[PDB]
Structures are given as C-alpha cells and as structure tokens.
Symmetry: C2
C-alpha cells in the first residue's frame, strides 16, 4: 500500500512539474487553453485512479492535498498568460469541477469523522480561493456572472455531499460554519467588480438562499 | 437470482399480511404506535437486504413496487386507528423516509433510462400520496406544519438523488415535471387545511425556493 501511494504521489508530482514547465514555455494563443484543459483532465484522472487502492487516512489525506496543489498550480500558471475571457472562465470552472469530483470520491471512504470534516473544509476553502483569482481577471460582467453562478452551485453540491456522510454535531457545526463563510467570501468579492446591478442582485440572492437550504438541511441531520 | 427474489417477495407478502392482521386486531393506545414503528423498519430492512443481491431490471422494479405497496398498506391501516397527533405524524413521516432510502439504494444499481424514470416518478408520486392522507386527518396546525415541511425536504432528497444519476434531457423532463407536480400538490393541500397564516407563509415560501434549486441544478447537466 505505501509503495503504491508513493508511486501515485511521485508520478503526480513529476507530471505536474512537466506541465508547469510547458505552460511557462508556450508564448501565446488559444493553444494555452487547449493545454490547460488537457493537463487538468490528465492529472484529475491519474489522481482519482489511486484512490481505489488506498486503505489508511494519511495516505488518503496526502493524496487529496497533493492533487489540490497540482490543479491550483496549473490554473495559477494560466493566470499569468494573456487569454480570452471565455476560455479563462471555462478553464477555471472546468478545473474547479474536477477538484470537486475527486474531493467527493475521496470523502466516500474516510470513516474518521474528524478527518472527514477536515478534508471537507479544505476543499471548500480551495475551490473558493481559485474563484477569487479568476474574479480578479474577468473582463466582462456576463463572464463574471456565469462563473459566480457555478461557484454557488458547485460549492453547494460539495457542501451537501459532506453533510450526507457526517454524523455528529462537531462536524455538523464546522461544515455549516465554513459553508456560511465561503458563501460570504464569494458574494462579497463578486460584488466589488463592475457588473450590472440587477444581475448582481440575482447572483447575491441565489448565494443567500443556498446557505438557508444548507442550514435547514444540516439541522435535520 | 430469480430464486432469491422469489424468497424476498414471498416473505415480504407474508410479513405484510401478518402485520395487517395484527394492526386490525389491537384496539387501544400507544401500543399502536409501537407496532407500526417496529413493523415499518422490519419490512424495510428485509427489502434492503434483498436489494443487495443482483437482478434483472424488471425483477428490481417489481421488488421496489412490492415494498412500496407494503409500507403504504401498513400506513393506511394505522390511519383507521385513533392515535395521538404527534405519534401519528412521527409514524407516517418516519415510515415515508424508509421508502426514500430503499428507493435510493435501488436506483444505484439501475443502468437504463426507462427504469430510472419509472422508479423515480413512482416513488415521488407514492411519497407524496402518503402525506396527502396524513394531512387528510391532522389534528392541529403545528403538528401539520412540521410534517408538511418535511414533505418538501424528503421529496427533494429523492429528487436530486435521481437527478445526479440521470444522463439525458428526456429523463430530466420527467424529474422536472414530477417535482413541480409534487410541490404543487403539497402546497395546495396545506393551503386548504386550517393553520395560522404565519406558518402557511413559510410552507409556501419553501415550495417557491425548493422548486427553483431543482430547476437550476437539474438543468445544469
């Protein structure tokens, strides 16, 4: 088991480093978007394949942390590039969704409630961070709104996916508290950029009503 | 597998008939609540155990239908009895949840759209039907409201749980249309019932909210 996890971690690190170098190299154009999408998918699938074989907490915890760092680094690299707004949005949204998926896949095995809450809070924090960087770059209101929409829906899906498996109010409190904070962070940041006010009210309203449903649902756990 | 399904169906029929007779016999008090609560879990667990074993889609579909019929039959039996309001509500509410769970377990093994739609639409229909009878004889507003609220959430958990396994807009339409009908039926019956406006407002508000999130999330596929 330890050797298998070591192979997973080593190859993930190596492939991530090579992709980082390549992303640095290429000078311009939509080939950047193509490469970003390809690398995101490759690392996501490769990391997910390892989860099927682990059987212990630290191995799972390290696997999740490594993957989260890798995908963060890739999108961070694309941030430096000049790229079209729509391609940037699709890239970062596509990257985030893959982090959500692997986050959910790993959580399915963690029997220790404390670790389950910890791994949860981490991913909710991580996905929130990425959306902040994209919001610092989007060139148009419609692009920013669409990313904001996906931010609420994905974080909700990750939040509930945790609540199903949590079982004791120590986890229930923290997952509720973290979800509230993350929702506020996204909404507060998104409100700062230039966008049509009516669309902004809609986005903020949707953000507000999701936290209510989460809180209503968590209370019934 | 056919023989295993035969054993499952036969024993489910036997136990159902036996509890039907017993519930007919007894004539007083909280012993009725005890009997119903114990009986519901017994049939559910036996169904869940059988569902673990493989089957052809139709065999699975029959298994789900049989269980749904049984738990409805027991609930209908208790309806004829006098009971304390809280015990009656907790009985039929707690019974309904077990139909939800078995429906969730069954859907995990489906592999075709026809079964996914049929099983989904049926269970959302059935769970809605039971609440109709519970509300048909509720004693007081506060008890009626608390169970009426649960009617929204427990339909939602099944609705989205189906949504995430479906893969085609044709199936998506069935889930969307059924969810709208179920929400309206609950709202209409609760509106007809006698209850304070303050509670009736939140019940209507939750319906307005909860259909929208399904409308968004089921569309995002």
């Amino acid at each position: 088991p330890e050797a298998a996890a070591e192979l997973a971690l080593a190859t993930i690190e190596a492939i991530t480093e090579l992709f980082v170098d390549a992303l640095e190299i290429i000078r311009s154009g939509e080939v950047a978007s193509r490469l970003a999408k390809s690398g995101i998918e490759v690392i996501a699938e490769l990391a997910e394949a390892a989860i099927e074989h682990i059987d212990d907490p630290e191995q799972l915890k390290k696997i999740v942390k490594k993957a989260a760092e890798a995908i963060k680094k890739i999108v961070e690299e694309l941030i430096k590039k000049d790229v079209e707004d729509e391609l940037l949005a699709e890239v970062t949204s596509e990257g985030n969704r893959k982090l959500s998926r692997i986050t959910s896949k790993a959580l399915t095995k963690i029997k220790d409630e404390k670790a389950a809450a910890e791994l949860t809070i981490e991913a909710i924090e991580a996905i929130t961070e990425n959306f902040l960087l994209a919001l610092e770059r989007i060139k148009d209101g419609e692009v920013a709104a669409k990313l904001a929409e996906d931010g609420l829906l994905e974080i909700y899906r990750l939040a509930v996916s945790g609540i199903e498996h949590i079982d004791n109010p120590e986890e229930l409190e923290k997952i509720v508290k973290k979800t509230e904070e993350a929702v506020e962070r996204i909404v507060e940041a998104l409100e700062k950029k230039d966008v049509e006010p009516e669309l902004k009210e809609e986005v903020e309203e949707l953000g507000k009503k999701l936290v209510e449903i989460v809180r209503k649902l968590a209370e019934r756990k």
